[model samples]
Target: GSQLCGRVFKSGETTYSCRDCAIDPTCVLCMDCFQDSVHKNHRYKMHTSTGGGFCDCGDTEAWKTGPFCVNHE
Candidate 1:
């Protein structure tokens, strides 16, 4: 699993992917990381297919099922 922001992939956290950035193909950023100024106005998608598992939102504990974390709208 990919690690960033001093943590490895965690359960229930949806990763933000820069959809259009060529260098962002495998960059799996947590919500806190995505909020960094580096990603300002960048196209991003929260999903299991790109680089993260589905986020849990009290419904299930299974990864990749898509509750998509809390920071997202």
Candidate 2:
């Protein structure tokens, strides 16, 4: 776990979006962020970024549940 890694997603990058945590479909996280968070048992969706997408690991506006992961929290 680390701080809010607001890193940009690369083109065709694989990511995860947890329905139990995300407040919108645009919310996404990299594998590192996903595994470092509390989404292990939550319903999550996979995604392939086209490009320029940001990891939403700590954005309160994008998540309903806890926004920051264990690292950022």
Candidate 3:
């Protein structure tokens, strides 16, 4: 299924949970998911990312309005 974002490997591959936006299907909530603002009008900041998630928005300090995905190091 498209829900499979990627996989992990120790010796073999193991599928991980879908890390996509929690919004309903059909809504491309990337801006909301990444920027912490979903509906534009509904404005509120919250940490959107945690461990194991990947985001390519930009610098951490710059995203003061949003959450932090794992550092791209």
Candidate 4:
């Protein structure tokens, strides 16, 4: 449960966010990480970053449900 992708999601990139895990609006996931996450069954949302963001895959404080990704589990 100590994984942290920390990858930057650039503009025009398709990222994902999970409402069920949200602690901040900054929390997001890259496609690879998103599909590998348990949040697939969660209240997640699709978002294409118009700006840019980082993947919050395993950031404990970034999510209420903690890390929901397989890498973090």
Segments in model 2 whose C-alpha atoms lie over 4 Å from true places: 1-3
Model 1 over residues 9-29: C-alpha lDDT tens digits?
555556666554424244445
> Which candidate number maximizes lDDT?
2
Q: In candidate 3, where is summed lDDT lowest over 10 consecutive residues?
A: 1-10
- Per-residue CA lDDT of model 2 for 1-73, tens digit only, reads 4367798988989999998878877888888878888885699989898988888887778888867777777
Q: Which ranges of candidate 4 are over 4 A from the true structure?
A: 66-68
List where candidate 3 sits over 4 angstroms from the true fold: 1-29, 32-38, 52-73
Which parts of model 1 are misplaced by more than 4 Å?
1-4, 22-24, 48-73
**lDDT by residue for model 3 (1-73), tens:** 1121121123222212123332322122233233333223344233333333332222223233322222221
Q: In order, what lDDT does every prediction score? A: 0.42, 0.82, 0.27, 0.80
How does residue 60 of candidate 3 score in lDDT? 28
Q: Roughly what TM-score does model 4 have, to 2 decimal places?
A: 0.81
Model 2: how far is 70 from its true place, Å? 1.6
Model 4 clashes, total count: 0
TM-score of each: 0.46, 0.84, 0.18, 0.81
> Which is the leading candidate under TM-score?
2
How many clashing pairs per prediction, in order?
1, 0, 0, 0
